[PDB]
């Protein structure tokens, strides 16, 4: 009994793991995930940067970051409005870095941006043109999370 | 060995449970669930109130109920068309009650409504502009379920 | 007590099985699955027929198959563009069959189709107005999968 039931439950657990993996594949598919491409998702809610980071972190994802023009357009299409990107110069003013770490390898700054305007701007929002504008991390913009290809 | 295998399997199960909860959170988010707000969702199918109740119950949710103007707008945008709300005045005519219990707090009745028109109207539909109209429970309207925040 | 921990594990696993089933049901509901009806899903990606089959099969579904006009309309609404159907005449030219078996019954061919045009056309796409056109299986069209009622 004991050992047989124990061996069975290991197979029951592996079966459930396979099923959950499949469920995740189906949900990603219905969410628009393209083959071998990272995908972006939003609940269309606007909130401050820290809340977006906490929200995407919970979902085991990260705040959306475009690494090229294609991804930048992908994020733009998903958000439909201004959306925070996972990029900030909070550590050293004027020096933008990915929240995941490192200096920028691609950018699409609007003319004369980033400018740390007025009282200060350490976050970044992709606007309705695909262009970028640094803005207050306290302002509320659309939450867009990113998941791996 | 046995006690160690069992311990290791309990660990795997806990991990699977967390992963499943993550799948549920990502799904709700992708479908528009707002932070700290109830999750409203529909399959766009129209059916009698009894069927709507059975359907949401089977999903472990309940027929959508607007507790305030914010929730009412939320349900309105998810439904798109006329949809049943989890409210009826089946016990005492004129006394609308939530299917989950309690007297109606918030309401958004249309002019000249509720009117218990014709042979009687004990159910409620959110219609145009998000206003409410009492209607026959046997009539077919969109099924919108709600899940907790 | 080993036996008590084992019985609890059995209860934990069964609880997970029920919860995963609920997650699958809720996701299908959110994706538009109507009661007693099969449902269709797409990620809007365009690809050759063999890729669509492979992808749908992996999700334990199949390339969408319109068995009647209601389903055809449903597939048309989900796809939004030209999409492959789970129907081909690869086995015997001129004789269309479902990928899962059986000779084609209901059909919605555009005038003068199918025509096995040029070097040949053994696949089928639902196009404009929801009508059908036989096309090369090597061409890339929208991937739409169907799942059981
Ligand atoms: O130009 C500036 O306009 C302000 C309204 C604000 O958007 C700043 O971020 C811009 O740099
Ligand atoms: O006015 C009435 O019109 C009927 C057609 C029905 O919609 C009733 O519920 C309304 O109160
Ligand atoms: O008519 C034909 O036009 C070709 C361009 C191709 O679409 C064929 O499948 C059609 O039968
Ligand atoms: Ca600063
Ligand atoms: Ca700055
Ligand atoms: Ca700026
Ligand atoms: Ca009555
Ligand atoms: Ca009444
Ligand atoms: Ca009425
Ligand atoms: Ca042929
Ligand atoms: Ca010919
Ligand atoms: Ca042919
Ligand atoms: Ca043709
Ligand atoms: Cl700031
Ligand atoms: Cl009634
Ligand atoms: Cl072909």
Short mmCIF file of C-alpha atoms and ligand atoms in Angstrom, two decimals:
data_model
loop_
_atom_site.label_atom_id
_atom_site.label_comp_id
_atom_site.label_asym_id
_atom_site.label_seq_id
_atom_site.Cartn_x
_atom_site.Cartn_y
_atom_site.Cartn_z
CA UNK A 1 0.00 0.00 0.00
CA UNK A 2 2.19 2.81 1.33
CA UNK A 3 4.96 2.60 -1.28
CA UNK A 4 2.56 1.93 -4.13
CA UNK A 5 0.41 4.94 -3.19
CA UNK A 6 3.53 7.04 -2.82
CA UNK A 7 4.77 6.06 -6.30
CA UNK A 8 1.33 6.79 -7.70
CA UNK A 9 1.17 10.26 -6.20
CA UNK A 10 4.50 11.14 -7.78
CA UNK A 11 2.93 10.33 -11.16
CA UNK A 12 -0.25 12.22 -10.14
CA UNK A 13 1.90 15.28 -9.36
CA UNK A 14 3.87 15.05 -12.62
CA UNK A 15 0.59 14.71 -14.49
CA UNK A 16 -0.75 17.85 -12.84
CA UNK A 17 2.48 19.68 -13.65
CA UNK A 18 2.08 18.76 -17.34
CA UNK A 19 -1.53 19.81 -17.33
CA UNK A 20 -0.73 23.18 -15.73
CA UNK A 21 2.07 23.79 -18.24
CA UNK A 22 -0.46 23.11 -21.01
CA UNK A 23 -3.02 25.43 -19.44
CA UNK A 24 -0.32 28.15 -19.33
CA UNK A 25 0.50 27.54 -23.02
CA UNK A 26 -3.19 27.85 -23.93
CA UNK A 27 -3.62 31.03 -21.90
CA UNK A 28 -0.49 32.59 -23.44
CA UNK A 29 -1.85 31.66 -26.91
CA UNK A 30 -5.24 33.25 -26.19
CA UNK A 31 -3.35 36.27 -24.79
CA UNK A 32 -1.72 36.84 -28.18
CA UNK A 33 1.70 35.31 -27.50
CA UNK A 34 3.38 34.81 -30.90
CA UNK A 35 5.71 31.85 -31.47
CA UNK A 36 9.16 32.44 -30.00
CA UNK A 37 8.24 36.03 -29.07
CA UNK A 38 8.06 37.64 -25.63
CA UNK A 39 4.56 38.88 -24.90
CA UNK A 40 3.00 41.91 -23.28
CA UNK A 41 -0.23 42.04 -21.31
CA UNK A 42 -2.25 44.76 -19.60
CA UNK A 43 -5.41 45.01 -17.54
CA UNK A 44 -5.70 48.61 -18.84
CA UNK A 45 -5.31 50.01 -15.33
CA UNK A 46 -3.35 53.23 -14.76
CA UNK A 47 -1.22 53.45 -11.60
CA UNK A 48 2.13 54.80 -10.26
CA UNK A 49 5.35 53.07 -11.33
CA UNK A 50 5.98 51.35 -8.00
CA UNK A 51 2.56 49.68 -8.20
CA UNK A 52 3.19 48.50 -11.75
CA UNK A 53 6.48 46.94 -10.66
CA UNK A 54 4.84 45.25 -7.68
CA UNK A 55 1.96 44.04 -9.85
CA UNK A 56 4.14 42.56 -12.59
CA UNK A 57 6.49 41.08 -9.98
CA UNK A 58 3.57 39.17 -8.42
CA UNK A 59 2.74 37.72 -11.84
CA UNK A 60 6.39 36.71 -12.18
CA UNK A 61 6.87 39.11 -15.06
CA UNK A 62 8.53 42.52 -15.41
CA UNK A 63 7.43 46.02 -16.42
CA UNK A 64 7.49 46.07 -20.22
CA UNK A 65 10.79 46.94 -21.88
CA UNK A 66 11.25 47.35 -25.65
CA UNK A 67 14.69 46.22 -26.87
CA UNK A 68 14.01 47.22 -30.49
CA UNK A 69 11.50 49.02 -32.72
CA UNK A 70 9.36 45.92 -33.14
CA UNK A 71 8.88 45.33 -29.40
CA UNK A 72 8.34 49.06 -28.92
CA UNK A 73 5.45 48.91 -31.37
CA UNK A 74 4.13 45.73 -29.72
CA UNK A 75 3.98 47.48 -26.34
CA UNK A 76 2.37 50.51 -27.97
CA UNK A 77 -0.41 48.37 -29.49
CA UNK A 78 -1.14 46.56 -26.22
CA UNK A 79 -1.24 49.70 -24.07
CA UNK A 80 -3.26 51.93 -26.41
CA UNK A 81 -2.40 54.84 -24.08
CA UNK A 82 0.65 56.14 -22.22
CA UNK A 83 2.33 53.25 -20.37
CA UNK A 84 5.26 52.96 -18.00
CA UNK A 85 8.32 51.13 -19.27
CA UNK A 86 10.74 49.22 -17.07
CA UNK A 87 13.35 51.99 -17.37
CA UNK A 88 14.29 54.74 -14.84
CA UNK A 89 17.16 57.03 -13.82
CA UNK A 90 16.30 56.79 -10.09
CA UNK A 91 19.78 55.61 -9.12
CA UNK A 92 21.77 58.30 -10.93
CA UNK A 93 20.00 61.30 -12.41
CA UNK A 94 20.40 61.49 -16.18
CA UNK A 95 21.51 57.86 -16.42
CA UNK A 96 18.62 55.66 -17.52
CA UNK A 97 18.80 51.96 -16.74
CA UNK A 98 16.58 48.91 -17.12
CA UNK A 99 14.83 47.88 -13.91
CA UNK A 100 16.23 44.42 -14.67
CA UNK A 101 19.62 46.12 -14.72
CA UNK A 102 21.99 47.71 -17.22
CA UNK A 103 22.31 50.70 -19.54
CA UNK A 104 20.00 51.25 -22.54
CA UNK A 105 20.72 49.38 -25.78
CA UNK A 106 17.73 50.92 -27.56
CA UNK A 107 15.66 54.06 -27.03
CA UNK A 108 12.99 56.10 -28.79
CA UNK A 109 13.08 59.44 -27.04
CA UNK A 110 10.77 62.21 -28.15
CA UNK A 111 12.71 65.36 -29.14
CA UNK A 112 14.43 67.03 -26.17
CA UNK A 113 13.51 64.19 -23.79
CA UNK A 114 14.37 62.92 -21.20
CA UNK A 115 14.50 66.28 -19.45
CA UNK A 116 13.75 65.63 -15.75
CA UNK A 117 11.15 68.39 -16.14
CA UNK A 118 9.99 70.60 -13.32
CA UNK A 119 9.94 68.91 -9.92
CA UNK A 120 11.66 65.86 -11.42
CA UNK A 121 11.05 62.83 -13.64
CA UNK A 122 12.77 59.48 -13.12
CA UNK A 123 10.37 57.13 -14.91
CA UNK A 124 9.57 56.57 -18.56
CA UNK A 125 6.32 56.31 -20.49
CA UNK A 126 5.88 55.20 -24.06
CA UNK A 127 3.29 57.59 -25.49
CA UNK A 128 0.65 57.23 -28.24
CA UNK A 129 3.28 57.79 -30.95
CA UNK A 130 5.61 55.08 -29.76
CA UNK A 131 7.95 57.88 -28.66
CA UNK A 132 9.28 58.13 -25.10
CA UNK A 133 8.93 60.81 -22.43
CA UNK A 134 10.43 60.69 -18.96
CA UNK A 135 7.73 61.44 -16.40
CA UNK A 136 7.10 61.41 -12.65
CA UNK A 137 7.15 57.89 -11.21
CA UNK A 138 4.25 59.10 -9.04
CA UNK A 139 1.98 59.81 -12.00
CA UNK A 140 -0.47 57.07 -13.03
CA UNK A 141 0.05 55.38 -16.38
CA UNK A 142 -1.06 52.08 -17.93
CA UNK A 143 0.40 48.91 -16.44
CA UNK A 144 1.97 46.63 -19.03
CA UNK A 145 3.75 43.50 -17.93
CA UNK A 146 6.22 41.45 -19.94
CA UNK A 147 6.76 37.70 -20.04
CA UNK A 148 9.57 35.68 -21.76
CA UNK A 149 9.56 34.40 -25.35
CA UNK B 1 13.41 7.14 2.46
CA UNK B 2 9.61 7.10 2.66
CA UNK B 3 9.44 10.08 5.00
CA UNK B 4 11.89 11.97 2.79
CA UNK B 5 9.96 11.20 -0.41
CA UNK B 6 6.75 12.31 1.26
CA UNK B 7 8.38 15.56 2.45
CA UNK B 8 9.74 16.27 -1.01
CA UNK B 9 6.33 15.60 -2.54
CA UNK B 10 4.60 17.95 -0.10
CA UNK B 11 7.10 20.60 -1.24
CA UNK B 12 6.24 19.94 -4.91
CA UNK B 13 2.52 20.22 -4.17
CA UNK B 14 2.92 23.58 -2.38
CA UNK B 15 4.88 24.84 -5.39
CA UNK B 16 2.18 23.63 -7.80
CA UNK B 17 -0.52 25.34 -5.74
CA UNK B 18 1.38 28.65 -5.93
CA UNK B 19 1.91 28.23 -9.65
CA UNK B 20 -1.83 27.57 -10.16
CA UNK B 21 -2.71 30.65 -8.13
CA UNK B 22 -0.29 32.62 -10.34
CA UNK B 23 -2.09 31.28 -13.44
CA UNK B 24 -5.40 32.48 -11.98
CA UNK B 25 -3.96 35.94 -11.21
CA UNK B 26 -2.41 36.35 -14.64
CA UNK B 27 -5.66 35.26 -16.26
CA UNK B 28 -7.77 37.78 -14.31
CA UNK B 29 -5.26 40.55 -15.05
CA UNK B 30 -5.22 39.72 -18.79
CA UNK B 31 -9.02 39.89 -18.74
CA UNK B 32 -9.07 43.34 -17.14
CA UNK B 33 -9.29 42.75 -13.39
CA UNK B 34 -8.24 45.94 -11.59
CA UNK B 35 -6.11 45.96 -8.41
CA UNK B 36 -8.30 45.63 -5.34
CA UNK B 37 -11.44 45.36 -7.48
CA UNK B 38 -13.78 42.46 -8.22
CA UNK B 39 -13.23 40.56 -11.46
CA UNK B 40 -16.13 40.83 -13.95
CA UNK B 41 -16.31 38.51 -16.96
CA UNK B 42 -18.68 37.23 -19.66
CA UNK B 43 -18.82 34.68 -22.49
CA UNK B 44 -21.34 36.98 -24.25
CA UNK B 45 -24.02 34.30 -24.07
CA UNK B 46 -27.65 35.30 -23.42
CA UNK B 47 -29.82 33.03 -21.30
CA UNK B 48 -32.55 33.07 -18.61
CA UNK B 49 -31.59 34.25 -15.13
CA UNK B 50 -31.72 30.72 -13.68
CA UNK B 51 -29.12 29.63 -16.21
CA UNK B 52 -26.92 32.62 -15.50
CA UNK B 53 -26.98 31.73 -11.79
CA UNK B 54 -26.15 28.10 -12.44
CA UNK B 55 -23.33 29.04 -14.79
CA UNK B 56 -21.60 31.49 -12.46
CA UNK B 57 -22.02 29.08 -9.53
CA UNK B 58 -20.36 26.30 -11.49
CA UNK B 59 -17.37 28.62 -12.01
CA UNK B 60 -17.37 29.38 -8.28
CA UNK B 61 -18.41 32.98 -8.89
CA UNK B 62 -21.77 34.80 -8.68
CA UNK B 63 -24.01 36.82 -10.99
CA UNK B 64 -22.45 40.29 -11.30
CA UNK B 65 -23.55 42.85 -8.71
CA UNK B 66 -22.74 46.62 -8.84
CA UNK B 67 -22.16 47.92 -5.28
CA UNK B 68 -21.33 51.42 -6.50
CA UNK B 69 -21.05 53.57 -9.63
CA UNK B 70 -17.51 52.38 -10.31
CA UNK B 71 -18.54 48.73 -10.30
CA UNK B 72 -21.62 49.52 -12.36
CA UNK B 73 -19.47 51.11 -15.08
CA UNK B 74 -17.11 48.11 -14.93
CA UNK B 75 -19.97 45.66 -15.52
CA UNK B 76 -21.35 47.92 -18.24
CA UNK B 77 -18.15 47.83 -20.28
CA UNK B 78 -17.73 44.06 -19.88
CA UNK B 79 -21.32 43.29 -20.91
CA UNK B 80 -21.62 45.57 -23.96
CA UNK B 81 -25.28 44.50 -24.17
CA UNK B 82 -28.16 44.01 -21.71
CA UNK B 83 -27.11 41.74 -18.84
CA UNK B 84 -28.67 40.26 -15.71
CA UNK B 85 -27.50 41.55 -12.34
CA UNK B 86 -27.52 39.42 -9.19
CA UNK B 87 -30.59 41.20 -7.84
CA UNK B 88 -34.28 40.19 -7.63
CA UNK B 89 -37.43 41.18 -5.73
CA UNK B 90 -38.81 37.62 -5.61
CA UNK B 91 -39.56 37.58 -1.85
CA UNK B 92 -41.37 40.90 -1.39
CA UNK B 93 -42.35 42.83 -4.51
CA UNK B 94 -40.52 46.14 -4.64
CA UNK B 95 -37.87 44.91 -2.22
CA UNK B 96 -34.84 44.11 -4.34
CA UNK B 97 -32.24 41.87 -2.70
CA UNK B 98 -28.82 40.61 -3.80
CA UNK B 99 -28.81 36.93 -4.71
CA UNK B 100 -25.97 36.64 -2.18
CA UNK B 101 -28.06 38.26 0.54
CA UNK B 102 -28.94 41.72 1.80
CA UNK B 103 -31.09 44.66 0.79
CA UNK B 104 -30.22 46.73 -2.22
CA UNK B 105 -27.85 49.55 -1.27
CA UNK B 106 -26.77 51.13 -4.58
CA UNK B 107 -29.13 51.34 -7.56
CA UNK B 108 -29.13 52.99 -10.98
CA UNK B 109 -32.71 52.67 -12.17
CA UNK B 110 -33.82 54.09 -15.50
CA UNK B 111 -36.71 56.62 -15.51
CA UNK B 112 -40.05 55.02 -14.68
CA UNK B 113 -38.24 51.89 -13.44
CA UNK B 114 -38.61 49.51 -11.66
CA UNK B 115 -42.17 49.11 -12.89
CA UNK B 116 -42.85 45.35 -12.54
CA UNK B 117 -44.29 45.69 -16.06
CA UNK B 118 -46.85 43.28 -17.51
CA UNK B 119 -47.37 39.95 -15.78
CA UNK B 120 -44.48 40.90 -13.51
CA UNK B 121 -40.73 41.61 -13.56
CA UNK B 122 -38.64 40.33 -10.66
CA UNK B 123 -35.15 40.31 -12.26
CA UNK B 124 -32.81 43.14 -13.18
CA UNK B 125 -30.77 43.99 -16.27
CA UNK B 126 -28.11 46.64 -16.71
CA UNK B 127 -28.94 48.17 -20.10
CA UNK B 128 -28.13 51.31 -22.12
CA UNK B 129 -25.82 53.88 -20.55
CA UNK B 130 -25.43 51.53 -17.61
CA UNK B 131 -28.93 52.22 -16.27
CA UNK B 132 -31.16 49.48 -14.86
CA UNK B 133 -34.48 47.98 -15.96
CA UNK B 134 -36.39 45.28 -14.12
CA UNK B 135 -37.39 42.46 -16.46
CA UNK B 136 -38.77 38.93 -16.48
CA UNK B 137 -36.37 36.36 -15.05
CA UNK B 138 -37.38 34.04 -17.90
CA UNK B 139 -36.10 36.50 -20.51
CA UNK B 140 -32.64 35.86 -22.03
CA UNK B 141 -29.85 38.32 -21.31
CA UNK B 142 -26.07 38.29 -21.16
CA UNK B 143 -24.38 36.22 -18.46
CA UNK B 144 -21.83 38.23 -16.48
CA UNK B 145 -20.17 36.60 -13.50
CA UNK B 146 -18.16 38.22 -10.75
CA UNK B 147 -15.24 36.89 -8.73
CA UNK B 148 -13.75 38.48 -5.55
CA UNK B 149 -11.13 41.22 -5.51
CA UNK C 1 2.20 9.40 11.15
CA UNK C 2 3.08 8.48 7.58
CA UNK C 3 -0.43 7.31 6.71
CA UNK C 4 -2.02 10.59 7.86
CA UNK C 5 0.40 12.63 5.74
CA UNK C 6 -0.33 10.36 2.77
CA UNK C 7 -4.10 10.79 3.10
CA UNK C 8 -3.64 14.57 3.36
CA UNK C 9 -1.51 14.52 0.22
CA UNK C 10 -4.28 12.65 -1.59
CA UNK C 11 -6.73 15.36 -0.47
CA UNK C 12 -4.29 18.11 -1.59
CA UNK C 13 -3.90 16.53 -5.03
CA UNK C 14 -7.65 16.04 -5.54
CA UNK C 15 -8.24 19.65 -4.46
CA UNK C 16 -5.68 20.75 -7.08
CA UNK C 17 -7.35 18.65 -9.77
CA UNK C 18 -10.68 20.33 -9.02
CA UNK C 19 -9.16 23.80 -8.94
CA UNK C 20 -7.29 23.30 -12.23
CA UNK C 21 -10.54 22.12 -13.83
CA UNK C 22 -12.24 25.31 -12.57
CA UNK C 23 -9.41 27.41 -14.00
CA UNK C 24 -9.81 25.68 -17.37
CA UNK C 25 -13.60 26.27 -17.26
CA UNK C 26 -13.28 29.94 -16.30
CA UNK C 27 -10.69 30.56 -19.03
CA UNK C 28 -12.93 28.92 -21.65
CA UNK C 29 -15.86 31.05 -20.41
CA UNK C 30 -13.69 34.18 -20.63
CA UNK C 31 -12.67 33.21 -24.17
CA UNK C 32 -16.29 33.10 -25.31
CA UNK C 33 -17.13 29.41 -24.95
CA UNK C 34 -20.93 29.13 -25.11
CA UNK C 35 -22.70 26.38 -23.12
CA UNK C 36 -22.69 23.04 -24.91
CA UNK C 37 -20.64 24.57 -27.73
CA UNK C 38 -17.02 24.08 -28.65
CA UNK C 39 -14.90 27.20 -28.53
CA UNK C 40 -12.36 28.82 -30.77
CA UNK C 41 -9.17 30.64 -29.90
CA UNK C 42 -6.44 32.42 -31.88
CA UNK C 43 -3.25 34.36 -31.13
CA UNK C 44 -3.66 36.08 -34.51
CA UNK C 45 -0.33 34.71 -35.76
CA UNK C 46 -0.11 33.65 -39.42
CA UNK C 47 1.69 30.43 -40.35
CA UNK C 48 1.75 27.43 -42.75
CA UNK C 49 -0.88 24.74 -42.18
CA UNK C 50 1.49 22.14 -40.70
CA UNK C 51 2.45 24.70 -38.02
CA UNK C 52 -1.18 25.38 -37.16
CA UNK C 53 -1.89 21.65 -36.79
CA UNK C 54 1.17 21.18 -34.62
CA UNK C 55 0.30 24.14 -32.41
CA UNK C 56 -3.37 23.19 -31.92
CA UNK C 57 -2.51 19.54 -31.37
CA UNK C 58 -0.02 20.56 -28.68
CA UNK C 59 -2.82 22.44 -26.89
CA UNK C 60 -4.95 19.29 -27.14
CA UNK C 61 -7.30 20.94 -29.59
CA UNK C 62 -7.42 20.93 -33.40
CA UNK C 63 -7.43 23.39 -36.29
CA UNK C 64 -10.88 24.97 -36.23
CA UNK C 65 -13.59 23.10 -38.16
CA UNK C 66 -16.95 24.72 -39.02
CA UNK C 67 -19.55 21.91 -38.71
CA UNK C 68 -22.40 24.33 -39.48
CA UNK C 69 -23.11 28.01 -40.20
CA UNK C 70 -23.22 29.09 -36.54
CA UNK C 71 -19.73 27.68 -35.97
CA UNK C 72 -18.55 29.18 -39.25
CA UNK C 73 -19.68 32.63 -38.09
CA UNK C 74 -18.02 32.06 -34.71
CA UNK C 75 -14.72 31.11 -36.36
CA UNK C 76 -15.01 34.10 -38.71
CA UNK C 77 -15.47 36.50 -35.76
CA UNK C 78 -12.53 35.04 -33.82
CA UNK C 79 -10.17 35.03 -36.83
CA UNK C 80 -10.87 38.52 -38.22
CA UNK C 81 -8.73 37.55 -41.25
CA UNK C 82 -8.10 34.54 -43.51
CA UNK C 83 -7.51 31.41 -41.42
CA UNK C 84 -6.87 27.71 -42.05
CA UNK C 85 -9.63 25.21 -41.28
CA UNK C 86 -9.15 21.60 -40.19
CA UNK C 87 -10.23 20.40 -43.65
CA UNK C 88 -7.96 19.21 -46.52
CA UNK C 89 -7.97 16.94 -49.59
CA UNK C 90 -4.36 15.82 -49.10
CA UNK C 91 -5.24 12.14 -48.85
CA UNK C 92 -7.26 11.94 -52.08
CA UNK C 93 -7.42 14.92 -54.44
CA UNK C 94 -10.90 16.36 -54.78
CA UNK C 95 -12.16 14.59 -51.70
CA UNK C 96 -12.15 16.87 -48.71
CA UNK C 97 -11.88 15.38 -45.23
CA UNK C 98 -11.67 16.66 -41.67
CA UNK C 99 -8.16 16.45 -40.20
CA UNK C 100 -9.71 14.32 -37.45
CA UNK C 101 -11.45 12.01 -39.91
CA UNK C 102 -14.52 11.78 -42.09
CA UNK C 103 -15.69 13.22 -45.37
CA UNK C 104 -16.66 16.89 -45.46
CA UNK C 105 -20.38 17.48 -44.91
CA UNK C 106 -21.36 21.09 -44.29
CA UNK C 107 -19.39 23.48 -46.50
CA UNK C 108 -19.33 27.18 -47.36
CA UNK C 109 -17.30 27.44 -50.57
CA UNK C 110 -17.08 30.71 -52.48
CA UNK C 111 -18.43 30.45 -56.03
CA UNK C 112 -16.14 28.38 -58.27
CA UNK C 113 -14.23 26.89 -55.32
CA UNK C 114 -12.61 24.55 -54.49
CA UNK C 115 -10.51 24.52 -57.67
CA UNK C 116 -7.09 23.03 -56.76
CA UNK C 117 -5.62 26.06 -58.51
CA UNK C 118 -2.24 25.97 -60.26
CA UNK C 119 0.24 23.39 -59.02
CA UNK C 120 -2.43 22.47 -56.50
CA UNK C 121 -4.33 23.48 -53.36
CA UNK C 122 -5.09 20.94 -50.67
CA UNK C 123 -5.86 23.15 -47.67
CA UNK C 124 -8.78 25.41 -46.87
CA UNK C 125 -9.10 28.94 -45.54
CA UNK C 126 -12.14 30.78 -44.30
CA UNK C 127 -11.88 34.21 -45.93
CA UNK C 128 -14.21 37.18 -46.64
CA UNK C 129 -17.85 36.95 -45.59
CA UNK C 130 -16.81 33.70 -43.99
CA UNK C 131 -16.77 31.91 -47.36
CA UNK C 132 -14.15 29.26 -48.10
CA UNK C 133 -11.29 28.97 -50.62
CA UNK C 134 -8.96 25.99 -51.06
CA UNK C 135 -5.35 27.17 -50.86
CA UNK C 136 -1.78 25.93 -50.64
CA UNK C 137 -1.01 24.31 -47.28
CA UNK C 138 2.40 26.06 -47.52
CA UNK C 139 0.80 29.52 -47.48
CA UNK C 140 0.65 31.34 -44.15
CA UNK C 141 -2.76 32.07 -42.68
CA UNK C 142 -4.13 32.80 -39.21
CA UNK C 143 -3.89 29.97 -36.66
CA UNK C 144 -7.28 29.27 -35.07
CA UNK C 145 -7.82 26.27 -32.78
CA UNK C 146 -11.03 24.65 -31.62
CA UNK C 147 -11.62 22.89 -28.31
CA UNK C 148 -14.48 20.42 -27.43
CA UNK C 149 -17.99 21.44 -26.38
O1 LIG D 1 7.70 68.87 -22.27
C1 LIG D 1 7.27 68.49 -20.99
O2 LIG D 1 5.86 68.62 -20.85
C2 LIG D 1 5.36 68.31 -19.53
C3 LIG D 1 3.86 68.55 -19.56
C4 LIG D 1 5.73 66.86 -19.16
O3 LIG D 1 5.05 65.95 -20.01
C5 LIG D 1 7.24 66.65 -19.31
O4 LIG D 1 7.55 65.28 -19.09
C6 LIG D 1 7.69 67.05 -20.71
O5 LIG D 1 9.10 66.93 -20.81
O1 LIG D 2 -41.11 50.14 -20.38
C1 LIG D 2 -41.16 48.74 -20.43
O2 LIG D 2 -40.94 48.25 -21.75
C2 LIG D 2 -41.01 46.81 -21.87
C3 LIG D 2 -40.76 46.47 -23.33
C4 LIG D 2 -39.99 46.14 -20.92
O3 LIG D 2 -38.67 46.48 -21.33
C5 LIG D 2 -40.22 46.63 -19.49
O4 LIG D 2 -39.26 46.07 -18.60
C6 LIG D 2 -40.12 48.16 -19.47
O5 LIG D 2 -40.34 48.65 -18.15
O1 LIG D 3 -9.34 32.22 -57.70
C1 LIG D 3 -8.08 31.82 -57.25
O2 LIG D 3 -7.26 32.94 -56.94
C2 LIG D 3 -5.92 32.60 -56.53
C3 LIG D 3 -5.16 33.91 -56.32
C4 LIG D 3 -5.96 31.72 -55.27
O3 LIG D 3 -6.48 32.48 -54.18
C5 LIG D 3 -6.85 30.50 -55.52
O4 LIG D 3 -6.99 29.76 -54.32
C6 LIG D 3 -8.23 30.94 -56.01
O5 LIG D 3 -9.01 29.80 -56.33
CA1 LIG D 4 16.12 62.10 -10.03
CA1 LIG D 5 15.33 62.20 -14.00
CA1 LIG D 6 10.06 64.75 -19.60
CA1 LIG D 7 -43.05 40.00 -8.00
CA1 LIG D 8 -40.96 42.85 -9.33
CA1 LIG D 9 -39.23 47.22 -16.34
CA1 LIG D 10 -3.75 17.28 -54.52
CA1 LIG D 11 -7.64 24.84 -63.16
CA1 LIG D 12 -6.45 19.73 -54.33
CA1 LIG D 13 -8.78 27.98 -54.78
CL1 LIG D 14 10.05 60.81 -10.39
CL1 LIG D 15 -39.90 37.69 -13.12
CL1 LIG D 16 -1.31 22.25 -50.99
#
